[PDB]
Amino acid sequence: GDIMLIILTGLPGVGKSTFSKNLAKILSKNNIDVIVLGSDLIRESFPVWKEKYEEFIKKSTYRLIDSALKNYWVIVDDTNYYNSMRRDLINIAKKYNKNYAIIYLKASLDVLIRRNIERGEKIPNEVIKKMYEKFDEPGKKYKWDEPFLIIDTTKDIDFNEIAKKLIEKSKEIPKFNISDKIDKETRKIVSEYIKSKKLDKDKIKEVVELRKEFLKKIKKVDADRVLKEFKDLLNSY
Amino acid sequence: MGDIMLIILTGLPGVGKSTFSKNLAKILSKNNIDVIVLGSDLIRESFPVWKEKYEEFIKKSTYRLIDSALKNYWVIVDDTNYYNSMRRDLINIAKKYNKNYAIIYLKASLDVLIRRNIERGEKIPNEVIKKMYEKFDEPGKKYKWDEPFLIIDTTKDIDFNEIAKKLIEKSKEIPKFNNISDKIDKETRKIVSEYIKSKKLDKDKIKEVVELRKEFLKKIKDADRVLKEFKDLLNSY
C-alpha cells in the first residue's frame, strides 16, 4: 500500500515536535505526502484555555486526522499519554485499512525537566514529575499497543533508517475511558491554576497532592460533575 | 449570555491580520466571549513542503473547522480572503447556522506592506505583494453583503475596547442574508511565488515571470490541467 498513520507518544519535553519535523522532511524528501497534526493546533487557536474547549479540540483533531488519512501519511504529534488515545487513533487507521506505527520517544526524567525549564516552565516541573511516575509505557498491556520503534532522544537518531523502515512497513497488509478523562482534565486544571495563580513551590506541591487525594476518593460517576467539583475544591483551598 | 458571530478578516499579506486576530481574541475573551481564530495556514503549515495539490485539502479542512466551530464559538477568520468568492463561502457558513457576521477590512499603504515583507525575510517576493496590491478589489465593491463592518487602518492606533463593543452590539442584532477563475488566479500566483524563491531568481528574471503569468492568464481566459501547463511553462521558461 502506501498511506500510513504514525502515532507518536511520550512525555512533554521529550522532543516529539522536533522529531515530527525531521521525520516529515525526510519523508517528503522521499516523495511521501505527509502532514503533522496534533491537538495543539486547535487548542492554541483559542486565546485562553478552558476545560470546556477540550471536547471540541479532541474531536477536531480526530476529524482532521481521519480526513487527512485518506490522502496522506499523518504523523500525530501528541503526548498520547493514555492507551485509549492510542486506541482512538488506531481505530482511525482501521476504518480505512491503513497501516500504522506507534513510535515511542523517551528520555530521563532529568532531561524532561530541564527541557521544561528551558521552555519557560509553562507546564509545572512537578506536574511533569507526576506525569513521568505514572506513565504506563505503550504495549505493556495490548498487542496492538506495541511500539514499532522505541527511540532514545538523548542518543543519535537515524531518520533515514526510520524512513526506510516506515516505508517498508507501509506496504505490508495491516493486521488488527471516563477515568482517563478525569485524570487528564484534573491534571490540566491543576496546571492552569498553578500558572494563573502564579503559585509558589510550596502551594504547587500541596495542590498536586490535593489532586492525588481527590482522585483516590473518586476511584473508590459522572466526569463532568467530577471536574466541576474539582475546580470548587481548588478554589475552596 | 450572548450570541455567536463570524468575524471575517481580509487584507493583503503583512497588513497585520494575524496580530489583529490575537488582540481581538484577547479582548473578547476578557468580556467572557468564547472565540477561536482559524486560518488556512494552520493546515497549510502542517505540511513540510508546499504542493498545489494540497490546496483543495487545506481549503476544505479550514471550512470544516470554521463550520464546526461556529456552532459553539465566535470565530475570527485570519486569512487574506483576497477574492470576494472566498468571503461569500465564509458568509454562507454563517448563513447556514443563522449567525451574524462582520467583515473587517485591514488596510495599509504599499510601502508599509513592503517593509513588513522585507522585515519578515521576503518569504513572498516583493513583486508579488506589489502585484497583489494593484489587483486587490476591496470588499463591498459590488455586493451589499460584501461591505466591511469596519475598515481598519493598521498604521494608526487601534481602540480594541471600541471594536469589541460594536461587535457585541452586532452579535445581538437579528441576521440578514467564477470560483474556477479565482482558483486559477490564486494558484498561478502561489506557483509564481514558489518559483521565485526556490530557484533564487534575480530581479529582472522576477519581472519576466510576473508578466509571463499575466500573459498566461490572458490566453487561458480545467483548473488542474491549466495549473500543470502553467507549471510546464515556468520550467521551460
Brief overview:
Two copies of one chain form a homodimer. Chain A has 237 residues and is α/β, with parallel strands linked by helices.
Features:
homodimer, 237 residues, alpha/beta, Rossmann fold, Lyase 2-enoyl-coa Hydratase, Chain  A, domain 2, 10 helices, globular, transferase
Largest sheet of chain A: 5 strands, parallel
CATH superfamily of the largest domain in chain A: P-loop containing nucleotide triphosphate hydrolases
Tell me the series of helices and strands of chain A, N- to C-terminal: EHEHHEHEHHEHHHH
Taking all Cα atoms into account, the compactness measure Rg of chain A is 19 Å
Helix content of chain A: 55-70%
Count of helices of chain A? 10
Specify the oligomeric state: homodimer
| Overall number of structural domains of chain A | 2
- Percentage of β-strand residues of chain A: 5-15%
The end-to-end span of chain A amounts to: 56 Å
InterPro entries (chain B): KTI12/PSTK, L-seryl-tRNA_Sec_kinase_arc, P-loop_NTPase, Ser-tRNA(Sec)_kinase
Protein name (chain B): L-seryl-tRNA(Sec) kinase
Pathway (chain B): Aminoacyl-tRNA biosynthesis; selenocysteinyl-tRNA(Sec) biosynthesis; selenocysteinyl-tRNA(Sec) from L-seryl-tRNA(Sec) (archaeal/eukaryal route): step 1/2
Binding site for ATP (chain B): 11-18
